[PDB]
C-alpha cells in the first residue's frame, strides 16, 4: 500500500563482499573547461544483471588499497539513466560524477578517491558495482501526478532518469500526462548538465514539462540578488504553494547537502502568508510521501 512505483523493487542484489563486475563503455566530461570543476557522464555495461529502476543508486568499490593496507569501502551514486538505459537495451547503467579535488590547510591538493577513479576510467576497464539500492526517490505510481524536482549539481541524476522515462520512452503502462517541473541550480553556465536533453523535452511536450535553470554566478533576481535555486523558485511562490496544497503533488530534492536550508527559508515565508508553519507542515507532507529528500 504505497504511492510510489515499488511493486517488485529489487534491492541489495549484489553485495560489496562480492559485487557485479562490469565494463566501462563510455566516459565523457560534460561541463565546460571554464566551469568551477569537472563532472563526467559514464555508461557501464551490466548485461541486464543489475535490476534497477528510476530513482535508485548503485554503489561502486574503487580499485586500490587504503592508507592502512585495506581495500576501499563503497561510495553511492544516483543512477543517471532510466531503467532501459541510454542504449534502450536494458543492458547498461549510467552515472553523473563530480571530480572531487580540493586543498587542505596543510596546503596540499587533495583528490577524492572514488570520484577520480570513476572520472579516470577508460572504455573497457572493469568497475565493481553493488546494489541496486534505494526506495526513497522512486517515481509516483500515478501517471498524472505533479512531479516537482529540485536539484543542484549531480543532484540532477535521478531526475534525468525520471524524465527519460516520462518523455523519451514509450511504455505500455506509463503514459505520463501530468506536470513535471524541474529546477536546476548551478554556478556558471559551463556547469549546466544535460541541458540539450532537457530543452528537447520542453519542445517535445510544452504542455507537460516545465524547465527552470538557476545559474548563481550570472543571474540576478528582482532586487539584484544572486540566483540560487530557491531564488528562482520564489518567482513561482504562490503557484508552487498552491500546487503543494493539492494531493497529487510530489516534490523531490536531490544534490549537495547545503541546499535544504536555502529552500526551507523560502518555504517558511511562503507558508505563513497562508497562516501556516512550514516546519510542521513539512512533517505531514513527508509522512504522506510528498516531500522526498536525498541530499549528500
Ligand atoms: C545517496 C548518495 C548519492 C550520491 N550521488 C552522487 C552523484 O550522483 N554524483 C556524485 O558525484 N557524487 C554523489 N555522491 C557522493 C559520492 O558518494 C562520494 O561521496 C563523492 O563522489 C566523493 O567521494 P570520493 O571517494 O571521491 O572522496 P573521498 O576519498 O571519500 O573523500 C571525500 C571526503 O573528503 C572530505 N572533503 C570533501 N570536500 C572537502 C573540502 N572541500 N575540504 C576538505 N575536506 C573535504 C570529506 O570528509 C569527504 O567525505 C552521492 C552520495 C550519496 C550518499
- Residue whose Cα lies nearest atom 48 of ligand 1: it is 112
**Could you give the residue numbers annotated as active site?**
77-78, 254, 294, 296
Last residue of a domain, one of 133, 148, 177: 133
Taking the C-alpha atoms of residue 52 and residue 79, their distance in angstroms, rounded to an integer, is 9
- As a residue count, the chain comes to 296
CATH value at residue 142:
3.40.50.80
Q: Which domain holds residue 83?
A: 1-133
User: Vertex 107, ends 103 and 111: CA angle to 5°?
Assistant: 30
- Sorted by sequence, the CB contacts under 8 Å of residue 231 that are 6+ apart come out as 214, 221, 225
262 is in an annotated binding site: no
90 contacts 83 by C-beta, under 8 angstroms: yes
139, 79: one domain = no
For 171-176, which contacts have Cβ atoms below 8 Å and span 24 or more sequence positions? Answer: 174/143, 175/143, 176/143, 176/144, 176/208
Here the cell at position 61 is 568499490
23 and 145, same domain (yes or no): no
One domain, residues 140 and 127: no
Ligand 1 atom, smallest distance to 134 CA: 1
> In this structure, what are the phi and psi dihedrals at residue 53, rounded to the nearest 5 degrees?
-140, 165
Ligand 1 site, residue 78, Cβ cutoff 6 A:
yes
Q: Give every CB contact of residue 144 below 8 A, 6+ residues apart in sequence.
A: 176, 177, 178, 248
For the record, the C-alpha cell of 40 comes out as 563526467
Give the H or E element holding residue 162: helix 157-167
Resolution of this PDB entry, in A? 2.5
> Are residues 102 and 159 both part of a single domain?
no
**296 CA to centre of ligand 1 in angstroms:** 8
8 A C-beta contact, residue 127 and residue 61: no
Q: Which helix (H) or strand (E) holds 252?
A: strand 249-255
Ligand 1, closest atom to CA 114? 25
Helices (H), 168-276: 195-204, 229-234, 237-244, 259-272
Q: Virtual CA dihedral for 26, 27, 30, 34, nearest 10 degrees?
A: -150
Split into its structural domains, the chain has a count of 2
Q: Residue 163 has which C-alpha cell?
A: 524524465
Positive or negative CA dihedral for 179, 185, 189, 192? negative
- Residue 102 marked as a ligand binder: yes
Which of these three, 105, 133, 161, is where a domain ends? 133
Give 105 Cα–ligand 1 centroid separation in angstroms: 18
The structure was resolved experimentally with: X-ray
In the structure grid, which three cell numbers stand for residue 210, read together? 516545465
Please name the residue whose Cα sits nearest to atom 44 of ligand 1: 104
Q: Are residues 147 and 279 in the same domain?
A: yes
Same domain, 45 and 175: no
- Cell numbers given for 73: 569501502
Do residues 213 and 83 share a domain? Answer: no
Q: How far is CA 80 from CA 75, 113, 159, 182, in A?
A: 15, 20, 8, 15
Of 133, 150, 179, the residue that ends a domain is 133
Q: What letter would DSSP give residue 139?
A: P
Please count the other Cβ atoms lying within 10 Å of the Cβ belonging to residue 9: 17
Report, in angstroms and rounded to the nearest whole number, the Rg of the chain calculated over CA atoms.
Answer: 19
> What CATH number does residue 60 fall under?
2.40.30.10
Q: Find the 86 Cα to ligand 1 centroid distance in Å.
A: 25
Amino acid at each position: 500500500h504505497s504511492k510510489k512505483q515499488d511493486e517488485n523493487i529489487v534491492v541489495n542484489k549484489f553485495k560489496p563482499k562480492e559485487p557485479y563486475v562490469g565494463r566501462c563503455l563510455l566516459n565523457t566530461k560534460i561541463t565546460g573547461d571554464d566551469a568551477p570543476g569537472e563532472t563526467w557522464h559514464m555508461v557501464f555495461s551490466t548485461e541486464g544483471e543489475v535490476p534497477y529502476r528510476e530513482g535508485q543508486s548503485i554503489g561502486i568499490v574503487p580499485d586500490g588499497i587504503d592508507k592502512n593496507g585495506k581495500p576501499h569501502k563503497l561510495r553511492l551514486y544516483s543512477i543517471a539513466s532510466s531503467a532501459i538505459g541510454d542504449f534502450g537495451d536494458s543492458k547498461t547503467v549510467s552515472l553523473c560524477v563530480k571530480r572531487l579535488v580540493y586543498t587542505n590547510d596543510a596546503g596540499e591538493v587533495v583528490k577524492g578517491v572514488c570520484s577520480n577513479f570513476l572520472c579516470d576510467l577508460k572504455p573497457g576497464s572493469e568497475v565493481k558495482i553493488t546494489g541496486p539500492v534505494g526506495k526513497e526517490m522512486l517515481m509516483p505510481k500515478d501517471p498524472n501526478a505533479t512531479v516537482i524536482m529540485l536539484g543542484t549539481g549531480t543532484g540532477i541524476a535521478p531526475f534525468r532518469s525520471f524524465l527519460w522515462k516520462m518523455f523519451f520512452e514509450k511504455h505500455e503502462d506509463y503514459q505520463f500526462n501530468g506536470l513535471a517541473w524541474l529546477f536546476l541550480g548551478v554556478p556558471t553556465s559551463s556547469s549546466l548538465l544535460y541541458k540539450e536533453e532537457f530543452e528537447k523535452m520542453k519542445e517535445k511536450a510544452p504542455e507537460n514539462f516545465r524547465l527552470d535553470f538557476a545559474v548563481s554566478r550570472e543571474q540576478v533576481n528582482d532586487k539584484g540578488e544572486k540566483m540560487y535555486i530557491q531564488t528562482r523558485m520564489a518567482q513561482y511562490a504562490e503557484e508552487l504553494w498552491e500546487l503543494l496544497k493539492k494531493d497529487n503533488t510530489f516534490v523531490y530534492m536531490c544534490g549537495l547537502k547545503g541546499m535544504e536550508k536555502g529552500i526551507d527559508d523560502i518555504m517558511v515565508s511562503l507558508a505563513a502568508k497562508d497562516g501556516i508553519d512550514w516546519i510542521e507542515y513539512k512533517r505531514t507532507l513527508k509522512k504522506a510521501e510528498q516531500w522526498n529528500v536525498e541530499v549528500y
